[PDB]
Amino acid sequence: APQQINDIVHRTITPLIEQQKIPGMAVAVIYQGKPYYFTWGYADIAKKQPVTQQTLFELGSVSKTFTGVLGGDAIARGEIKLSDPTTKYWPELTAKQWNGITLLHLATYTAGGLPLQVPDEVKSSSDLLRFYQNWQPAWAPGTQRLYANSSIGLFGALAVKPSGLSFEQAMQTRVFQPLKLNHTWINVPPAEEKNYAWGYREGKAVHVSPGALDAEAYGVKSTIEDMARWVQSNLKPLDINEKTLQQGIQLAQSRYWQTGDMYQGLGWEMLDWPVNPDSIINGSDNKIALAARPVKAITPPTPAVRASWVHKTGATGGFGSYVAFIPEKELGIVMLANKNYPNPARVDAAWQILNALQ
Template sequence: WQPQWTPGAKRLYANSSIGLFGALAVQPSGMSYEEAMTRRVLQPLKLAHTWITVPQSEQKNYAWGYREGKPVHVSPGQLDAEAYGVKSSVIDMARWVQANMDASHVQEKTLQQGIELAQSRYWRIGDMYQGLGWEMLNWPLKADSIINGSDSKVALAALPAVEVNPPAPAVKASWVHKTGSTGGFGSYVAFVPEKNLGIVMLANKSYPNPARVEAAWRILEKLQ
């Protein structure tokens, strides 16, 4: 294998990169990813219904996704816990969004710093800024810019990237968002810290990203 581009020249989305980042982030702790997430993120934020491994006592509440009409759960895979392994409830995810909109209320200072660093701007790809997982666009913005930008033809394309050096700190006037999909499930999270507005959308079927973004936009637009 040989790289197609000079390092730092292009941004190409890949679940494996998120998985690798998660694995490397917890490596100095000596803990597994699941243990580190539970002790350092989920418990401090009181996300009592969020797990990597759903406990037996909660299996009855573990939603089934649907793929080609058949019920499915998340399939195991390489770096699955780190890349797409979190199972949660809409209430816990709403708490997660609240913590990300205003980390000053997070009592654990290391976690507070981590939340803020994740929304720092490290790379610019067109109108979008890449954080640590999060994608940000300057607010206010037009709906078309995020709806069209979420289409797979754009979101999964290799696009020119410009490094932000030094990284810019989190900007309150931002549309911060991330889609998520596995076989049988589709999710979307978006929030605008300046407006203290956010939304979590969880579905037990995968559907196109632009439809998720447009629905979220219309809902948040009505709440302003």
């Protein structure tokens, strides 16, 4: 790699691993559109299996960016509209509180207080209907953003209905394959299991457990090479050959809501570039990231702005991930670790790197 990149990465990430006690880490820096890779430590501590470019990490909520792009792809195909009522795609969801709640609201956490998590007792589709039928809004739709798996997870599930495909088959077929993400999985198949890293929580080896709407909200596992291609594709969607996917990516980076200096896309979140680092860093702390915030409607949505910092944090019990890129600079980073360490440490490190390189 260029020495500038080797220098800043080693000075920033290597001490981060020390400080946070991360067992294993992979990083990709996209620079002038080209990926550069860095690896540390172990995917499996007991078996002393090192992190490689073939190591699968759990993405956690970085999966929401795949869901937002799949959803945008179904819009470009004319299969769904974000202006459509939720109940048009789930006819059994008839309770009156759902009435003005659209696909847009579900995709952007603005339905009016759907909870962060689907309760773990909710297992069957029957359980799920009852949950949603019984849910009472804390706010009117399109007034507050409350980051929620039960919001975007439902969006994902309903977005694929017109196509008749299961969520996983739509995702493999319409997103993973055209982009040649050949090692990215919702369900890791047998042949890939020796590459699937352990996550570590309080020194125990953990994998993410099943849960309602997991695939849709936090269920993607991927490699650093595939993640770098993910960033490449989102950096320049016009280079993508599949027309609906190309439009899908730009739809997921449109700005539908503003809260402070932050804009909500579909999965992706954006700020104008140049950004105030304190904002992104402190903003990624769960005290702020998980709190209700008032939103201003952007009427109509601003299309993908090139001068943007586009980003997303992800975590499962054993993993912590981060993706950020600036389309105007052809610059990005991906950070995959098999320990869930604080979000502000991730963003701070990513900012130090991308700021040094822009």
